[PDB]
């Protein structure tokens, strides 16, 4: 009962678009969540298969695209990324109301 998050580490220059994948490895997922941690943990968006994600206060939809076309995968893409978007991003998923978390992705934008 485990979720993966690839890539675990990203370093890129201003303006690059970053993709992070969140996967259900050994179970049937429904909703996935995307968070961000400021060194605490901030919910950014909630995402069901087939629908467009819902975004929390402070998060703009086109800065943080979310795709979620199967019950097994969701992809966050921080589009045109800028230094202030640097930090730690974590995904989780519910099982078919406990969340299971991915290891996270450390992002550095320069």
């Amino acid at each position: 009962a485990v979720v993966s998050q690839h890539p675990s580490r990203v370093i890129v220059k201003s303006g690059t678009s970053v993709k992070i994948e969140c996967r259900s490895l050994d179970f049937q997922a429904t909703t996935m969540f995307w968070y961000r941690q400021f060194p605490s943990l901030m919910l950014m968006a909630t995402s069901n298969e087939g629908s467009k994600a819902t975004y929390e206060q402070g998060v703009e939809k086109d800065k943080f695209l979310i795709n979620h076309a199967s019950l097994t995968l969701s992809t966050l893409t921080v589009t045109s990324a800028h230094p202030e978007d640097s930090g730690f991003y974590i995904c989780s998923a519910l099982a078919g109301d406990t969340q299971y978390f991915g290891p996270g992705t450390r992002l550095t934008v320069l």
Binding site: N48, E49, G50, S51, K52, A53, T54, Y55, E56, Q57, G58, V59, E60, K61, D62, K63, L65, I66, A69
Partner: protein, 191 residues
């Protein structure tokens, strides 16, 4: 509750597709093939905005989903959407539309208000983007304090559009897409 439904609609994402191709164009609808191979079944309920694009022409989609996207078999991915089809003409350089926002009489600065590089946008798309700015950065629909108000567009040529933040956009009486470089001001007020 209905402030909650407005929040869910306008704080969620939208589908933005470029150079999709019209497969069919009936009265009240369009059937489009997106460049990622998804099919869009889009409703157009207004007699004032009846997209006229012919089979094989290229269109842009800036639109919202009216229910959960589904897979067939084969396994074609179908999107069910409303409004938001325009031509593909681009502006030479992207522009910031001139939004000013007030929350109870006070000037509220913008954050993450994006530039657009298209010539035209549906009014329904101007609605959802203006309101997205409001729900995400300025509190619209998230406290009892901030649940209604308006936005209003004003063109270089004098004409206007306005929507009421307390209610759903009026899809049934939507008017044709407009040229966004001719938007003189957009003003939005939360009350």
């Amino acid at each position: 509750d209905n402030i909650k439904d407005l929040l869910d609609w306008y704080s969620s994402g939208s589908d933005t597709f470029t150079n999709s191709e019209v497969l069919d164009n009936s009265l009240g609808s369009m059937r489009i093939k997106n460049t990622d191979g998804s099919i869009s079944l889009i409703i157009f309920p207004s007699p004032y905005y009846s997209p006229a694009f012919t089979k094989g022409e290229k269109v842009d989609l800036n639109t919202k989903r009216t229910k959960k996207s589904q897979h067939t078999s084969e396994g074609t991915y179908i999107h069910f959407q409303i409004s938001g089809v325009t031509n593909t003409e681009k502006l030479p350089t992207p522009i910031e539309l001139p939004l000013k926002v007030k929350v109870h009489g006070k000037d509220s600065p913008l954050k993450y208000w994006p530039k657009f590089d298209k010539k035209q946008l549906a009014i329904s798309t101007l609605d959802f983007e203006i309101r997205h700015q409001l729900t995400q950065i300025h509190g619209l629909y998230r406290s009892s304090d901030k649940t209604g108000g308006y936005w209003k567009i004003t063109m270089n040529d004098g004409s206007t559009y306005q929507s009421d933040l307390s209610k759903k956009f009026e899809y049934n009486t939507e008017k044709p897409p407009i040229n966004i470089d001719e938007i003189k001001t957009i003003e939005a007020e939360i009350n």
